[PDB]
From a paper:
BC-producing bacteria have a cellulose synthase operon in their genome. BcsC consists of about 20–30 residues of signal peptides, followed by about 750–900 residues of periplasmic domain of tetratrico peptide repeat (BcsC-TPR), and about 380 residues of the outer membrane domain of the β-barrel (BcsC-C). Thus, the TPR domain is believed to be important for exporting polysaccharides.
In this report, we determined the crystal structure of the N-terminal six TPR motifs in BcsC (BcsC-TPR(N6), Asp24–Arg272) from Enterobacter CJF-002. The crystal structure of BcsC-TPR (Asp24–Arg272) was determined at a resolution of 3.27 Å. There were five molecules in the asymmetric unit and the Matthew’s coefficient was calculated to be 3.9 Å3 Da−1 with a solvent content of 68.5%26. BcsC-TPR(Asp24–Arg272) is a helical structure formed by 14 α-helices (α1–α14). We found a non-TPR α-helix was inserted in the middle of TPR motifs in this structure. A comparison of five monomers in the asymmetric unit showed that they can be classified into three different conformations: chains A and C were type 1 (root mean square deviation (r.m.s.d.) was 0.74 Å for 243 Cα atoms), chains B and D were type 2 (r.m.s.d. was 0.38 Å for 204 Cα atoms), and chain E was type 3. The conformations of these three types were different at the turn region between α5 and α6. The C-terminal two helices (α12–α13) were not included for this calculation since this region was not built for chain E. These results indicate that BcsC-TPR(N6) consists of two structural domains, an N-terminal TPR domain (α1–α5), and a C-terminal TPR domain (α6–α11), connected by a hinge at Thr107–Ala111. Thus, α5 seems to interfere with the formation of the super-helix between TPR2 and TPR3 through the interaction with TPR2. Based on the superposition of types 1 and 3, the C-terminal super-helix changes its screw axis by a conformational change at the loop of Ser109–Gly110. Collectively, the inserted non-TPR region can be considered to play two important roles: covering the interaction region of the upstream TPR motif to separate from the downstream TPR motif, and changing the direction of the downstream super-helix at the loop.
Residue numbers in the entry: 26 to 268
The structure:
């Protein structure tokens, strides 16, 4: 990976862990390396917003507006700026209200009204693109956005889970297998990754390819309890060949 990418990723880590040391450091080197990068400008934009300096924030916003007006970074920053205070804040409060009470189409409608297709960075983007993924039509572009969030903020069990199941739901098994292996190198979700990689084996008829799929599952997962059942039924499956 580049150094900019590592610095920006450290910015996101610092943002996530409420440590503005890291944010400060990474920003400090970033604005010397690539001062006009909309991702860097957006990073400072968010920082200035956290410190309640809406003036400096706004200046950075304008800088982005004259530098990259149709970048995801700019419009996402615009959204965070809308939610920075007052009306937008409560719009969100209402969207999440209908989101939690189970008014899903209403909730999606409100979120569409606020984020207008570019949610503010962080977990809200995950929530939004997951909610949007619930719509059959919009599902595929939303899947694309989710894959992006997976590449930008790695290590999210829940996101990887939803992404894997979505990709299965659209017959994109290779990619879903990939997300399952990514969920397999990290401890948080192995049982889940195994669980999904073992409800795809149940849906294929006992066959040679069934067997090879199950043994491949056996090279990806070592232990667990789906693994034990995988071995048991693997033996049974390959014994069932030749009567």
């Amino acid at each position: 990976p580049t150094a900019q990418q590592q610095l920006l990723s450290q910015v996101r880590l610092g943002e996530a862990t409420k440590r503005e040391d890291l944010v400060r450091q990474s920003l400090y080197r970033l604005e010397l390396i690539d001062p006009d990068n909309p991702d860097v400008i957006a990073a400072r934009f968010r920082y200035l917003l956290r410190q309640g300096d809406n003036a400096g924030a706004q200046k950075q916003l304008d800088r982005m507006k004259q530098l990259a007006p149709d970048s995801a970074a700019y419009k996402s920053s615009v959204t965070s700026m809308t939610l920075s205070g007052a009306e937008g804040r409560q719009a969100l409060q209402q969207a999440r209200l209908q989101a939690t009470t189970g008014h899903v189409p209403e909730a999606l409608a409100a979120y569409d009204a606020l984020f207008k297709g570019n949610p503010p960075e962080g977990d809200l983007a995950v929530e939004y693109w997951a909610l949007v993924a619930k719509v059959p039509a919009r599902r595929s572009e939303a899947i694309t956005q989710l894959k992006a969030l997976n590449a930008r903020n790695p290590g999210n069990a829940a996101l990887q889970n939803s992404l894997a199941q979505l990709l299965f739901g659209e017959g994109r098994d290779a990619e879903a297998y990939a997300v399952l292996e990514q969920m397999a190198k990290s401890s948080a979700g192995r049982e889940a990754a195994a669980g999904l990689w073992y409800q795809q084996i149940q849906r294929m008829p006992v066959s040679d390819a069934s067997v090879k799929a199950l043994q491949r599952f056996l090279t990806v997962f070592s232990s667990g309890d789906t693994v034990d059942s995988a071995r048991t039924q693997l033996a049974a499956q390959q014994k069932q060949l030749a009567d």
